[PDB]
Amino acid sequence: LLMGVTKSALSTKSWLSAASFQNTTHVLTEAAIAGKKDELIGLKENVILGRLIPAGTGSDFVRFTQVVDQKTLKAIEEA
Amino acid sequence: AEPGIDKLFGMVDSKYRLTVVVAKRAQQLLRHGFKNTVLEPEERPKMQTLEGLFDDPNAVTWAMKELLTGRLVFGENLVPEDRLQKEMERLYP
Amino acid sequence: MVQVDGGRFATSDLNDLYRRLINRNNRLKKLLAQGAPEIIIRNEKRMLQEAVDALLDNGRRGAPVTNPGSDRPLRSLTDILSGKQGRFRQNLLGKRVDYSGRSVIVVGPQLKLHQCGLPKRMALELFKPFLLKKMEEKGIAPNVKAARRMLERQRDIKDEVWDALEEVIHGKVVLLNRAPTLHRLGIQAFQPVLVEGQSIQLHPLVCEAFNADFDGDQMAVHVPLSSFAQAEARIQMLSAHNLLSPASGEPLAKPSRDIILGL
Amino acid sequence: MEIKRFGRIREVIPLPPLTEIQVESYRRALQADVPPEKRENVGIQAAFRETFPIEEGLVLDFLEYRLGEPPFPQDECREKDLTYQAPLYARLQLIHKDTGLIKEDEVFLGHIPLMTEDGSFIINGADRVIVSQIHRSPGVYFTPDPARPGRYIASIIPLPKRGPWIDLEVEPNGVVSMKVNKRKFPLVLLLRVLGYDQETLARELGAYGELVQGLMDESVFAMRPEEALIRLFTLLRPGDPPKRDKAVAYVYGLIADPRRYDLGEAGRYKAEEKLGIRLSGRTLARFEDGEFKDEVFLPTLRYLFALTAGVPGHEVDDIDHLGNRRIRTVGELMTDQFRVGLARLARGVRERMLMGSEDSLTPAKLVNSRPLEAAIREFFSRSQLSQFKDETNPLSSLRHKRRISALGPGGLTRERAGFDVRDVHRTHYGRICPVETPEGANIGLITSLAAYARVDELGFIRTPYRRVVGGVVTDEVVYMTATEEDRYTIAQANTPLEGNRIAAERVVARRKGEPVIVSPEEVEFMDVSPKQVFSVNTNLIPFLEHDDANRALMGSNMQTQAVPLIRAQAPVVMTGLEERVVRDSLAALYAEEDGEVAKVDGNRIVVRYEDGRLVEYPLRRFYRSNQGTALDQRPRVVVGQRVRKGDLLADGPASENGFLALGQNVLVAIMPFDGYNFEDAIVISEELLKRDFYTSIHIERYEIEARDTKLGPERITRDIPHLSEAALRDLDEEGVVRIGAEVKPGDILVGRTSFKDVKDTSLRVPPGEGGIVVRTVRLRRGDPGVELKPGVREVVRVYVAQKRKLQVGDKLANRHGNKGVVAKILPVEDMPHLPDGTPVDVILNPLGVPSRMNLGQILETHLGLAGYFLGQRYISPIFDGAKEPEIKELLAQAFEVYFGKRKGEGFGVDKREVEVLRRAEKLGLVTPGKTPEEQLKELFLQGKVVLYDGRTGEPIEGPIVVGQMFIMKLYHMVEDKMHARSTGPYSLITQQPLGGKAQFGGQRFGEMEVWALEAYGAAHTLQEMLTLKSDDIEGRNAAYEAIIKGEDVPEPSVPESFRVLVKELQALALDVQTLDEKDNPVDIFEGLASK
Amino acid sequence: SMARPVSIGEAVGIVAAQSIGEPGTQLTMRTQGLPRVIEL
Amino acid sequence: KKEVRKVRIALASPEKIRSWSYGEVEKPETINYRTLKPERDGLFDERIFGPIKDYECACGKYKRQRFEGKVCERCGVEVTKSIVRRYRMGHIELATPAAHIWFVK
Amino acid sequence: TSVYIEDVLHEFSTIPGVKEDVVEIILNLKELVVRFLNPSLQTVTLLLKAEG
Amino acid sequence: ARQLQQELGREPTYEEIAEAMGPGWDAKRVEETLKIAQEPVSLETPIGDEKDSFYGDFIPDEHLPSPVDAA
Amino acid sequence: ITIGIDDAVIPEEKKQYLEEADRKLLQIEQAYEMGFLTDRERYDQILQLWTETTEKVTQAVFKNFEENYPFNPLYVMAQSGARGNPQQIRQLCGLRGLMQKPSGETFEVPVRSSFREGLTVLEYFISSHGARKGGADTALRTADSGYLTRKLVDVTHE
DNA sequence: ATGGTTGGGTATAATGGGAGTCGTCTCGGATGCAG
DNA sequence: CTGCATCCGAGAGCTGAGGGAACCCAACCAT
Ligand SMILES: [Mg+2]
Ligand SMILES: [Zn+2]
């Protein structure tokens, strides 16, 4: 199928972004009827929730990196 | 531009990983009052005021300098966090 | 329902909608308890339904409910939720922030590419807690409260406080932003150099990126607080680190206007 | 300094009074000075004669009205925040048809605001202006069908809120249909109602083809008129019981009732002219002897059929034509609001007549005047067309008074405007200035009246033309509308004349706006002057013909923002209109009659007229305008001086010897300078600051209130606890700063204590403000004429003055649209200087010229150089003024002076000048083989001089354009904009920082910015900004504590705005629940909302 | 912006949308112009 | 404190609404015109929504902390942080059912 | 460098019996050229008293 | 008040209304009575030409402690 | 670097180019009075001739600048790319050219004056149409582009 | 002990209201027509 | 039972700064 940008955006899985976009009453009533769960995949939902967006330094690929010097690493190795 | 930014960007596969490493190293330096630094006393970042040269209070510059020096090891799943912090406190109170 | 500074009262339309609903509900209960004929009960139920509709979505079926003496429709909960002025677009995707300022921009030809000229008063107001802590380190004030009272009045500020401020901002960067922000380059990080006067000094080579001129344009200044924010600003948002356009890959910070003429 | 003037066009008539559009309209609406027996039927008189008699029985009849004198003068109203108004009394008589007794009583109806001499109003102590509104004229129009070609739609339009629009259209089927109140139905029913037989319609519309065949319907025609009324009622109002009298009343009110439908004088005139028929009243039909009589429907149908059938002599209407658009001025809007209020008063009268005891009743008890006063207050306080008057300078007020707006109540909407409503129509020529208009979202919707235009009694803009007879231009001037203008060929004003005979074989002319070339015989009318094409603001730009329209627009708009200066000068190059502009603004003072001056003072002028009467004029001194600028009048006369009629007595703001003086004449050089004039920036010399150039006076008002509180009344007093004497030095014993004390941010102006046993609640100077306290005003309860709000005992106001000099960050502008911010102030020794040692004052970047195409500034600079060396000023009217040869001759004389001066002292040509002459010889600017003096003269005649660099002493490698330029400081000053905040007040609901400098607010980080933060990948910066800096209360408290304690800020939490969102979504009966990874509920409210 | 392979974690959707939208204001004039882009 | 990972939205039953509410609003009164204090059973009553002042009941019997969870016998107001006035809801019991317009229009 | 005038409280006032306001008086006085005949002299106060 | 205004031809003062009411009425009680007859205003009253500024957007919180006070 | 009025050199060829046009005009009128051309063809021919004249004037202006005054400020600004485009230079020196009515159709008479010579009232008034139309176009375009940018950001944000 | 508050009563006859809007475009259901 | 084909109603249209209409009558509860 092919749909314009507005209709493609309004058909997303996340009810938070769709509700904050346009046609708020329709999105909200459909989501409430369906009992939809928002998994917080995109950026707007995380911004609305005041969380760390899954991009840049907030990406799971990089945000768990640790840093340590050689002296402490050697001490842990002896331990 | 920050000195040696090109090398720092080439030292990592992703720039956000470099940013995370720099921020975490800066936090570690700030928490212990710059007593855990790996820089020699003549590589120390200086700042010039009327009274004289003192230590640079900005920890991010310290982190960039140490990352440039290459004496820091960084990666994923190196050491448990609790043990890491305890050992950090052991070497540098 | 709050008392304004002038002693008058200010209230939300939701209170009036709830009052109408409560009045109709109470009248319906009284009429039901009296065994009224079915025409009155039907009218009462219709009015209660209309009141509930007005509370939930005023101005959807029929003429919107208005306050007497005015033509302004009352704003229901949905009106609060939706629209350009609604909760989502006005308070969730965008907020007003602390540690920020705004001023007119002036050409900064003597600045380096990574530097911006910041007025002394703006820097003193923006970095006030850092300045208080650093003055505590020195002997300027015995405690933070004394530092705050001293910095409170303009004529109570001395010379060494300016040096303390200069030491505070050493190595740190601020974010400059010009509205409208059409691309990511509309926000950029700069090292502040303290200047006199009331105008922010901007490097000539970033004017094309900001789409800024000097016929009255104003720009806003923000201060990243934590170590993570400062690292992000210095490594990923430094002006000298953003030289090529993200859209085409061609240089975006380049000589323009007088520079080409001279060369 | 001598003034020399160019130009050949002679103006037969002078400019009309520039504020007449307001004054004449209001005077005609009020008719205050016309005796009641001779009052016409316009204005509020017409409203009175229309609403009355209030027929019920009893009949209340209007006899006459009068207006009393204002209770307080204008200045007293200004100080006490009162409205300058006059009481209105109407004398009425109540008669009883059954009895006969007449009770006559003059009833007070309320107050009507009075317009001052300059054309403004004083509403609640504030100066306000009513802006005229342009809208669609009432009448009958015919437009092409957009959907289907070859068919046309007829429209009948009344005045706004005076009836429904009625549409007529021939349906594809072939029958005609009328749409009213969005209800399509066949028109043949209404035609049958009005009493039309088949024979009449067939004879009247038969010739036009098959339309008349499709119009007849025997089912409808067979029905009698009354039955047709019932059928029409059931079609228009389905369900409503079809009573005979009720249907009569409904149909009468729809199209025949004078109190609901009213085609104005404009609509009547337009209908009569378009349809070639005669109206009896202002309605479409008449109800006489239980029968409807037609007035407009049959002519309209005839015109529609003729137009659809292609009969010659019938044309469609252009809805943007200025003959179909009209102007509602202040008087008409006020009269309409008065009519609404009078209708409400009529309702109240009728109700009281019904309910009141008929035995003991008088006109006074029946009439309640509250609705009329309420309507007038609403119109004069909340109407979008009533605007806070702009008085930055006299030109600002003059411009504002001539503004025409398409927006407002009943007007257009800014978001739904296309292109037809914003373009300059051909008929705008001489009626609306095509240049002056706002640049933002209001472009094309707000405009200005042309200089020579006059709005007639019907609302159509008229422009003047000279009558030409037999190729001879006469002195007769005819004011014509656009419709009349379309029928003639009008010659251009710049056509050559010898005596008064057109001395040109080919004449440029306009035919219905189309340019054409015609012989002198065919010309019927001639333009009066080029000045009539543009507005007053555009007429103040010299060399306007050398400027692109966009930059002329910018200059015209930006001349309004000029700030008055304490040393203002008139421009070196003027257009010759500054004296009329100053005179018509009522800013300066002129002698009423021939006389002699007796006393001169800084606040008073006493003149002895030849009548022997002494007349004293007080002078307004250091009075705060609405925009904070200081407007004062300074005497320009000496004791014993003889003054003729119209001679200047005192200079107004931004005026010098009766000439408009908005800025200063400064020496400018057009050259780049070290990047300090990069991208429109401007470099100025410190010599401007040394001699107090561009120094302005500004006044700020600070207001405080002492009211009643439950814990005790507020009180202004000197004794406030826990403040040292150093902050109470300047306060007097009454708690108010003494006059003349200097105040800085944080200083106390008015002391106040509130029951907390009391606490400090004084008013202090906000950050970034201050100056010298110049005035204090105290208004207490009980004072005559004082009307405070209930509960407030008294009010204290403080007026504080500032002397603002030019500084970096201030805005400067010329009259040609070149605007710039001061970027650098250099010492005098660093400025480029002439070989005689005179330094320049301003350096302008040449890169602003080639792409903006405003060449008028270059010609102004050349003429300014000539005037600087010749010591004179020049008048150069627009489109007929200084040309290149005249300026070259003037520059030749200026060079002769400039060089003979040097040569007399015994000096030759400098070596640096020789090098520059060699370089220019290589550049091809001078001819090789001439003496150095000849080359220098050639360069000077090209407007260029040898210039030296102040830092090195070496000359600039090429000759540089240098001359005098007129530059004005703009109201956008950086002092009023600079603002910063760390922490402050927060909003009630969202708990987010407030906005605005006054509230000590923070800057808004909008969606565009957040998107940029996301595009950089700066997740942590965004998270800090969205919680720790806006609405995470615990987060921001902990962040401030950690920063002041030296640690790093903690991790953020859920913002309060999301909690508000959850609470508001649950209130709509929607269960929003936050869950963790294991699908278990997570309580984000910390157990504060769980029972 | 760096003439090198893109880093993992870059929010390319926002960058793409901004990049497309930027020229449209003022750069694109007005079947043809901005209406064509909107229709597409 | 577990991290928030998903947000669910669903219809609310009358039982859910009654469990949300701390009490039924029976009167249309907002505040008293003399004392500027909330009226009993009104739209601002402190017994339903919480105290205006932190750790202080309406009648002043308790004005100190440590009384968390205690409801004053005279006034019926719990002693807790005043911020609970921005979280706690009330409810109105309709005599007859009414349709939610969102699902109708 | 300094001016004091009788019965005037600030620069933005007028003097009875005087055509010019105080601002213009300052502007005129700023054009005064004074020669000190003594090298050691550092400051002087000139006094003016006049009646119309 | 309206009857007094109609007969006298201008807005009456509080003392005249109090005198016209009779015994037990002074100007002070009349001011208080007019004071207590006031009705709250809407927080969403449009300010300025554009439909974006409301009255309630200019109302600060004076109850909750500021970050400086908490620290 | 400086800007004077004499720096906007008007080429001599322009005069000839105008006279030639005034020649063809007459021919065209003859071809319309004898039935060989209709209104539409004559209108198109006038537009074509004036367009070609404008292009030729542009070429002559720039050839003159390059051959006689290689260091002219306007020429240097245009050639270096610092500021200005050839159309603006042509309007400055040669002639403005054809103008559009508010209905969108061209006028029959062109603007034969440059900005250096000074315009008459009639040419200024006709050019006001294009100026106003461009301003209103900008005013609507900025809002429409903002709306498009918001929609694109919202559809691609994930 | 005191004012301010709360509910109840008034008897010729009195019997379907009243305000009103117009220069926008685009998208998706809804209804009625030919095949 | 398809397919067209209007026909009507619903919902949007840049940011930011700044915008200012009765009287009486008698019982009853809080404090
Ligand atoms: Mg700008
Ligand atoms: Zn209690």
UniProtKB/Swiss-Prot annotation, chain A:
The RNAP catalytic core consists of 2 alpha, 1 beta, 1 beta' and 1 omega subunit. When a sigma factor is associated with the core the holoenzyme is formed, which can initiate transcription. DNA-dependent RNA polymerase catalyzes the transcription of DNA into RNA using the four ribonucleoside triphosphates as substrates. Belongs to the RNA polymerase beta' chain family. This is DNA-directed RNA polymerase subunit beta'. It comes from Thermus thermophilus (strain ATCC 27634 / DSM 579 / HB8). The chain holds residues 1420 to 1498 of 1524 of the full protein.
Curated annotation (Swiss-Prot), chain B:
Its EC number is 2.7.7.6. It catalyses: RNA(n) + a ribonucleoside 5'-triphosphate = RNA(n+1) + diphosphate. One of its GO terms (molecular function) is DNA-directed RNA polymerase activity. It holds the Pfam family RNA_pol_Rpb6. GO terms for cellular component: DNA-directed RNA polymerase complex. Keywords: DNA-directed RNA polymerase, Nucleotidyltransferase, Transcription, Transferase. HAMAP family: RNApol_bact_RpoZ (MF_00366). Belongs to the RNA polymerase subunit omega family. Promotes RNA polymerase assembly. Latches the N- and C-terminal regions of the beta' subunit thereby facilitating its interaction with the beta and alpha subunits. This is DNA-directed RNA polymerase subunit omega. It comes from Thermus thermophilus (strain ATCC 27634 / DSM 579 / HB8).
Curated annotation (Swiss-Prot), chain D:
GO terms for molecular function: DNA binding; DNA-directed RNA polymerase activity; ribonucleoside binding. DNA-dependent RNA polymerase catalyzes the transcription of DNA into RNA using the four ribonucleoside triphosphates as substrates. The RNAP catalytic core consists of 2 alpha, 1 beta, 1 beta' and 1 omega subunit. When a sigma factor is associated with the core the holoenzyme is formed, which can initiate transcription. Gene3D superfamilies: 2.40.50.100, 2.40.50.150, 3.90.1100.10, DNA-directed RNA polymerase, beta subunit, external 1 domain, DNA-directed RNA polymerase, subunit 2, domain 6, RNA polymerase alpha subunit dimerisation domain, RNA polymerase Rpb2, domain 2. This is DNA-directed RNA polymerase subunit beta. It comes from Thermus thermophilus (strain ATCC 27634 / DSM 579 / HB8). One of its GO terms (biological process) is DNA-templated transcription. HAMAP family: RNApol_bact_RpoB. NCBIfam families: PRK00405.1, rpoB. Disulfide bonds: none annotated. The keyword Transcription applies. It is an enzyme of class 2 (transferase).
UniProtKB/Swiss-Prot annotation, chain H:
It is found in: Cytoplasm. Residues 1-70 are annotated as: Sigma-70 factor domain-3. It comes from the Bacteria. Belongs to the sigma-70 factor family. RpoD/SigA subfamily. Interacts transiently with the RNA polymerase catalytic core formed by RpoA, RpoB, RpoC and RpoZ (2 alpha, 1 beta, 1 beta' and 1 omega subunit) to form the RNA polymerase holoenzyme that can initiate transcription. Sigma factors are initiation factors that promote the attachment of RNA polymerase to specific initiation sites and are then released. This sigma factor is the primary sigma factor during exponential growth. Contains 4 domains, connected by flexible linkers. In the active conformation, the domains are in an extended conformation, each making extensive interactions with the RNA polymerase catalytic core. In the autoinhibited state, sigma-70 factor domain-1 packs closely together with sigma-70 factor domains-2 and -4, contrary to the extended conformation that is seen when the protein is part of the RNA polymerase holoenzyme. This is RNA polymerase sigma factor SigA. It comes from Thermus thermophilus (strain ATCC BAA-163 / DSM 7039 / HB27). The gene is sigA.
